[PDB]
Amino acid sequence: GIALGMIETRGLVPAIEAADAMTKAAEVRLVGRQFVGGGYVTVLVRGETGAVNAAVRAGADACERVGDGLVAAHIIARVHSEVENILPKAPQ
Amino acid sequence: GIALGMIETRGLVPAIEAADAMTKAAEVRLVGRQFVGGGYVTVLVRGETGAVNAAVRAGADACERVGDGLVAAHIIARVHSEVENILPKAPQ
Amino acid sequence: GIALGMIETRGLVPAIEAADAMTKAAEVRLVGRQFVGGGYVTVLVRGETGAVNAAVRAGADACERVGDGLVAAHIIARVHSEVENILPKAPQ
Amino acid sequence: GIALGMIETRGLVPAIEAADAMTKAAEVRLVGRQFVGGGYVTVLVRGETGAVNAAVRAGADACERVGDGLVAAHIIARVHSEVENILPKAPQ
Amino acid sequence: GIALGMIETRGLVPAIEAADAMTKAAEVRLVGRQFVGGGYVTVLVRGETGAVNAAVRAGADACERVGDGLVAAHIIARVHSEVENILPKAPQ
Amino acid sequence: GIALGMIETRGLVPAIEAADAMTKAAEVRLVGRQFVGGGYVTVLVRGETGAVNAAVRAGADACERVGDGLVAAHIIARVHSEVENILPKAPQ
Amino acid sequence: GIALGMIETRGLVPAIEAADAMTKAAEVRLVGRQFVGGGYVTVLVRGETGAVNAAVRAGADACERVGDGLVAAHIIARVHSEVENILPKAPQ
Amino acid sequence: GIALGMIETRGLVPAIEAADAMTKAAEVRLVGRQFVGGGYVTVLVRGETGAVNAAVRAGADACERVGDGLVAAHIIARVHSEVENILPKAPQ
Amino acid sequence: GIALGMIETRGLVPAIEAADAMTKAAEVRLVGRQFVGGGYVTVLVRGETGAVNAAVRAGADACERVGDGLVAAHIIARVHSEVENILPKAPQ
Amino acid sequence: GIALGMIETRGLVPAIEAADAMTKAAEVRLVGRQFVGGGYVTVLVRGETGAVNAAVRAGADACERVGDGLVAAHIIARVHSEVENILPKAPQ
Amino acid sequence: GIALGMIETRGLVPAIEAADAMTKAAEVRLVGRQFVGGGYVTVLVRGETGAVNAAVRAGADACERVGDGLVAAHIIARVHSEVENILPKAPQ
Amino acid sequence: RITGPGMLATGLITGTPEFRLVCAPRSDQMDRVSGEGKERCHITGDDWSVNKHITGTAGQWASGRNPSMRGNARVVETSAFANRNVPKPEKPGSKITGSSGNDTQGSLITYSGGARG
Amino acid sequence: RGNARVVETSAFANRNVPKPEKPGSKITGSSGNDTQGSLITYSGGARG
Amino acid sequence: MKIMQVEKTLVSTNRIADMGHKPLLVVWEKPGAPRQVAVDAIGCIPGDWVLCVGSSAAREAAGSKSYPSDLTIIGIIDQWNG
């Protein structure tokens, strides 16, 4: 799926909750979890647009109070082709 | 046991305490310790839900006053398969 | 085009937004994303100066309210060769 | 597709209107009509997430004014496999 | 014909009156009477669109004051194929 | 596990949301959905105690504002052998 | 059939919505769309009387709240041979 | 039939109604429909003076409340030879 | 995808901005621009329903303040086959 | 050039003033003058991004007091490739 | 004579008056009359600069109260070559 | 705070160890996007809607990219609809007698010269 | 005897259920467009 | 009411004002039958099988309680072959 939803959290516990929520809520694939540094962790899902929207809403709600919480929830429905190179393609 | 239990602490000493506490308290298996960055360390246990719940309470109260303390104590009872790709399988 | 537009954000979600915005906004090529530590993430685009200006304004505007936001938006219209060594050449 | 859309109505006329509307609006397949008792009729559709969204919205707009109306419009985008046993596969 | 007309009434007496009126007004086939639950009874007829329209309007006017009355009178000139599966084919 | 969790909702839509939520949340099995009459639908899950608590809580939180809502969310940890005769074994 | 159904709307979005509703609602064929000037766009359907009536009602509801709206919805059951010269035969 | 009758309307739906009425009312030939611009559509019929009179009158009444309505209904019994070059000789 | 989204604006500048936005925001294809008459221009995109929705909301927002702005924004998830004849296939 | 600058005016005289001003101001190619309908005229220029910016400013400043004035002045630095089809290549 | 004089009027009568006036006043050539749409007609004269000034003034004065009046009377002493593509060469 | 699945549903669960119009009024609402993009109805569940936390795609994201200036130009509509209320000359009456089908209560029909017909 | 929450669900109970505003027809043409009769609806909830 | 077929239009330029602008049609029950004239309130083409109302009702259908009509066409039958 083309769409990208991203949740950023302060800490990994919030990110895992968000991811679980996202993944459970809709048909999205977690394509990356990234430790940015400074304790920001970003979890990223790709799916069709409606799925991504539902997933991000869900994850955000979930992680808002887990740990230190949510920094950002963002959805980009079609990302520019170039932006794809900087985007993770498989979770590690 | 497919539940997850997670504790995030500021610093490693509080986390090792948490892991020790958790494992001692209940029938949980430690699956990881991760350095998130910024000083966040997440220790993660897996087990059945009643066990995980006991273990997370234990870990939290154990590490709360050790060091810089607890950031998050969280339990996810059924973890989605997608999320399992971002979770450490075995410790070390 | 050899101008450089760079945007620094606190966290990776704002940076992906900035990159997308810049690449969508004008004729610039994304050249890299770098994690600097402490949560600073820098995204860089290259292009003609006008293009870079447009792209960078757009990107700054996009990331400012996303996440922890923008730390910096800068344009260097001709980049010295020695500087090019420390510059990422193709995205990730 | 596996997303499920459900419209619940008071009475069968409103529900048939809902089903017709939902099926016409999007590529969704009607999977069931159930008489809950007390006059509630639930009509259920399966399709891809966006299709389901469109269909449900349409169906609700259609049935609100027919008869005694709509009690609920809901989309479960990824539906757990356990629930599939309670859900009706092909309509009667 | 393939149009569908439906009358849902509160109680069976109003519905039998409606069915009679409908079938009398125009050349329509009563394909079903359903007891929805809670007292809703739905009487459904098929025929050409004009026939169905005449029938439904006539039936509606008939049953409004019989019993607890009309809940709904609806006409659908083209029925999606999917909906046909939830509609009665003959009155049982 | 033999723990039983039951959620009663007015209408099927809330019940299906509840079932989904419960099943997604914890390791419980949906063993039944019953149409009580009067618009009440009961969704029943069996599992281990902790799992059932988690699941029921999740389910309630899910169906409360969906449709006509939740009438009852209940957990019984061990059910008597005699009450097992009245409990649905499979979700059929 | 020789009935004609006509909807005039202010702008083309309302008109496309009207045609869609019309055509989906009944067995009517869209024989044309016309730009009249001033932004009046007329969509013309043809079919038998019941069909046309149904379609025109449906179209009108659909297009009313879209854009700048509905200007006129009209049914002419039998169309004079002379009028047919000025009426479109195929959408084009 | 050398007389002229013209009805002008704001929109094409009122014009088709007018034409239909005219041609139905009397033995007149529709010789044109003209889109003046701005939303003005003129429909012109030619026949004997009584016929044209009848036609225009029926037409004006018919189109008056359709759509945005009648702008003008005019009968010209003897049309000057010069005026004939500007008048449509057959519909298009 | 086979959904349709449309933006109608007053003037071309607003519409071009809208089209650009729509195509950049999501996975949609511009299939047409039409000058309706009276300064209304409609820009039409096709794609998956969610994508189309996203795109349309984005176009709406972008174009609302450009020029004389937006008249309509609409999405149709499944288009009847007849309506497709009046709908432009590829941009001209 | 990649960039697009579009000025929309009410009347052609303001548009010609704008084109002249745009074309004189910077190196931009006039690619179309469009009579949209309703008195709206859009004059579109293509060039490098800095040039288009200058050109639009100049054109707007010029046309503002001439005639009925400026409706919109818009700059689009890289237009999505899809939008390129609805855009003129040489003025006609 | 490359200078351009342009008069825009609401309606053609004022414009013909303007043209006549202009051409009688000065040695200017009428190169075009254009219907912009929405009732605007632009009459365009080319000539040497003083001639064009005299002519435009005469034309404006003449057409100011004829019909619905003047919109613009404008003079451009040298038009850019690019603009000349959009300007009519001979009156026709 | 042990967050998790057991912090959910407070006050709605029993048997525990411790215990022992969907669609908004039409007249009021005019949807931003109509059709299948409408938001009048409250569709609960995992729908495609985006909340306050979520950022991206539409609001400033589309409205910022391209620079624009609008102008307050003179807007005068010339159309059949705009001219619906154009001032009109006094309506013609008929003084004719004899059977003329002289309806005076209907629409205005005019004859050469502007005469009521 | 206990005290129990009764929310009778029935056609009779729902007789007064709050409803959306009823459809009206702006259609013209002879279509038997009666307005004084019982509500009949067509697809989409349009008055018919 | 009666079922009759419109044969043709009828023009009477010297009709009473009360008749209004309403169109008048020559209707017969069958071809070669007595021909009657009806105010057309539906818009009916020649060859149409139509429904014609009787006298007090005709006036009201034709447009007023005080309209001069004794026969008005009130509907066109969708399918009839006489």
Author numbering:
A (entry chain G1), B (entry chain HX), C (entry chain H1), D (entry chain F2), E (entry chain B2), F (entry chain A2), ...: 6 to 97
L (entry chain X2): 712 to 731, 773 to 869
M (entry chain X4): 822 to 869
N (entry chain P1): 1 to 82
Reproduce, without paraphrasing, sentences from the article in which this PDB structure was first reported.
For instance, heterologous expression of minimal shell protein components derived from Halothiobacillus neapolitanus, including the hexameric shell protein CsoS1A, pentameric vertex CsoS4A, and CsoS2, allowed for the construction of a T = 9 icosahedral α-carboxysome shell with a maximum diameter of 36.9 nm. To address this issue, we reanalyzed our recently reported cryo-EM density maps without applying any symmetry (C1 symmetry). Fortunately, we were still able to obtain maps for the T = 9 and T = 16 α-carboxysome shells at resolutions of 2.77 Å and 3.71 Å, respectively. The construction of structures using C1 symmetry maps yielded T = 9 shells with a diameter of 36.9 nm and T = 16 shells with a diameter of 49.2 nm, which are virtually identical to the structures obtained under I symmetry. Nevertheless, in the T = 9 C1 symmetry map, no redundant density was detected, indicating that high-symmetry processing is unlikely to greatly impact the structural building in shells with smaller diameters. In summary, we show that excessive averaging in the highly symmetrical processing of α-carboxysome shell cryo-EM data can distort local densities, potentially leading to the loss of key structural details.
Carboxysomes are specialized microcompartments found in all cyanobacteria and certain chemoautotrophic proteobacteria, playing a crucial role in CO2 fixation and serving as a central component of bacterial CO2-concentrating mechanisms. These organelles encapsulate 2 cargo enzymes: Ribulose-1,5-bisphosphate carboxylase/oxygenase (Rubisco) and carbonic anhydrase, using a polyhedral proteinaceous shell. Self-assembly of the α-carboxysome is mediated by the intrinsically disordered protein CsoS2. CsoS2 functions as a linker protein, connecting cargo enzymes like Rubisco with the shell proteins.
